[PDB]
Design an enzyme around this catalytic site. Structure first.
Site, short mmCIF file in Angstrom:
data_model
loop_
_atom_site.label_atom_id
_atom_site.label_comp_id
_atom_site.label_asym_id
_atom_site.label_seq_id
_atom_site.Cartn_x
_atom_site.Cartn_y
_atom_site.Cartn_z
CB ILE A 151 -1.13 -0.10 1.02
CG1 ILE A 151 -0.40 -0.08 2.31
CG2 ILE A 151 -1.93 -0.93 0.94
CD1 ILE A 151 -1.38 -0.12 3.52
N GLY A 161 6.93 3.44 2.51
CA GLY A 161 7.18 4.72 3.59
C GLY A 161 8.67 5.22 3.64
CB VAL A 189 3.24 0.52 4.25
CG1 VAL A 189 2.15 0.41 5.06
CG2 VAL A 189 4.23 1.57 4.88
CE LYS A 206 2.57 2.19 8.59
NZ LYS A 206 2.39 3.67 8.28
CD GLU A 252 -7.06 3.06 13.78
OE1 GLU A 252 -6.26 3.81 14.56
OE2 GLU A 252 -8.14 3.31 13.44
CG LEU A 290 -7.60 4.81 9.50
CD1 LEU A 290 -6.39 4.32 10.28
CD2 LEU A 290 -8.10 6.25 9.69
CG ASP A 330 -2.53 9.58 1.65
OD1 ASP A 330 -3.47 10.18 0.85
OD2 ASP A 330 -1.48 9.18 1.39
CG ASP A 332 8.36 13.66 8.12
OD1 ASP A 332 8.46 14.88 7.36
OD2 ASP A 332 8.62 12.67 7.35
N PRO A 355 0.53 15.44 4.15
CG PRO A 355 -0.47 16.87 2.76
CD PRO A 355 0.92 16.54 3.40
C1 LIG Z 1 3.02 5.18 2.56
C2 LIG Z 1 2.22 5.13 3.72
N1 LIG Z 1 2.31 5.71 4.82
C3 LIG Z 1 1.41 5.38 5.58
C4 LIG Z 1 1.29 6.12 6.91
C5 LIG Z 1 0.40 4.32 5.26
C6 LIG Z 1 -0.82 3.82 5.85
C7 LIG Z 1 -1.88 3.29 5.21
C8 LIG Z 1 -2.92 2.83 5.90
N2 LIG Z 1 -3.01 2.69 7.35
C9 LIG Z 1 -1.81 3.11 7.66
N3 LIG Z 1 -1.98 2.84 9.23
N4 LIG Z 1 -0.85 3.53 7.25
S1 LIG Z 1 1.04 3.82 3.60
#
Ligand SMILES: Cc1nc(C)c(-c2ccnc(N)n2)s1
EC number: 2.7.11.22
Length: 290
Positions: free
Chosen positions: A10, A13, A18, A33, A73, A75, A78, A119, A122
């Site tokens: 997804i 990072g 991730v 992560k 968790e 979500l 973003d 840091d 968005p």
């Molecule tokens: C690159 C990414 N950065 C974050 C913060 C991601 C993410 C996506 C879905 N859920 C969480 N916790 N983190 S994917």
């Protein structure tokens, strides 16, 4: 790791890949992560108890085969993707206001425990279909550092970085997060990044051309900071009415206080929550997709 099944990648990072994954024990869908020095383990372990509804929950820290995995968790969206998707129309002001209010609550909580993000951007502000927004990766910068480039060589953005950091202050404060959040507020309102620098000096000079080159009147001690140069050009400050139209005067007042040069003057999260901009705050349902 045998307890987790990867569903899909997804993102990339700052520290590692991730994945969306399923926890086979709980049935839980999570964000997993890949990131170990004992100091990092202890710092990260402290973050397991820094729980708040506007902070993405750190479910577990797994250290194995000299490796660190953080389980968060999940979500679905973003704020960067939501702002791109809302470009033609803009995010509605009541929703901007709700998001800002919620993010300030998350910061006030963390800051009350003397934990900074450092840091904010968005891509680590995550949203759900209920109207919540949450801060992701809170506290990881102190645990692991903020590098120049990520593990995939991607440039870590400078756009939200506070001027004291750019000027070489070593011992910065919770005010750095207020600055970042002010930059994000402006970006939601105008649908363009406020200070999209592409080097440290470009970032600094972009700030100076909008807010004026700082001096000892507005920021006592600035001229002694490590990376301050007397040869910096002297730009005049812009009126916020030019910078963030059509934001109203309460919003412009609040933003201006979030963007004060002197970190000791910059509004706190707690004080910002009491600002009259939030008089009429509500919690709208966002127009999403998935
Ligand atoms: C690159 C990414 N950065 C974050 C913060 C991601 C993410 C996506 C879905 N859920 C969480 N916790 N983190 S994917």
């Amino acid at each position: 790791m045998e307890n987790f099944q990867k569903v899909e990648k997804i993102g990339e990072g700052t520290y590692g890949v991730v994945y969306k994954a399923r926890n086979k024990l709980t049935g839980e869908v999570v964000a997993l992560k890949k990131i170990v020095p004992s100091t990092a383990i202890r710092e990260i372990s402290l973050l397991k108890e820094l729980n708040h509804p506007n902070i993405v929950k750190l479910l577990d820290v797994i250290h194995t085969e000299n490796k660190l995995y953080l389980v968060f968790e999940f979500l679905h969206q973003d704020l960067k993707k939501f702002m791109d998707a809302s470009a033609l129309t803009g995010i509605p002001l009541p929703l901007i206001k709700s998001y800002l209010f919620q993010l300030l609550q998350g910061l006030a909580f963390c800051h009350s425990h003397r934990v900074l993000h450092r840091d904010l951007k968005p891509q680590n502000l995550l949203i759900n279909t209920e109207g919540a927004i949450k801060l992701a990766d809170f506290g990881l910068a102190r645990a692991f550092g903020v590098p120049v480039r990520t593990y995939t060589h991607e440039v870590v953005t400078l756009w939200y970085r506070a001027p004291e950091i750019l000027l070489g202050c070593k011992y910065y404060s919770t005010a750095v997060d207020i600055w970042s959040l002010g930059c994000i507020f402006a970006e939601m309102v105008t649908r363009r990044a406020l200070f999209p620098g592409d080097s440290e000096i470009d970032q600094l000079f972009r700030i100076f051309r909008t807010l004026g080159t700082p001096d000892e009147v507005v920021w006592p001690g600035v001229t002694s900071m490590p990376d301050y140069k007397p040869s910096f050009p002297k730009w005049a400050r812009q009126d916020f009415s030019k910078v963030v139209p059509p934001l109203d005067e309460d919003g412009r007042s609040l933003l201006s206080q979030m963007l004060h040069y002197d970190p000791n003057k910059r509004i706190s999260a707690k004080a910002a929550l009491a600002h009259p901009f939030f008089q009429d705050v509500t919690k709208p349902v966002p127009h999403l997709r998935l």
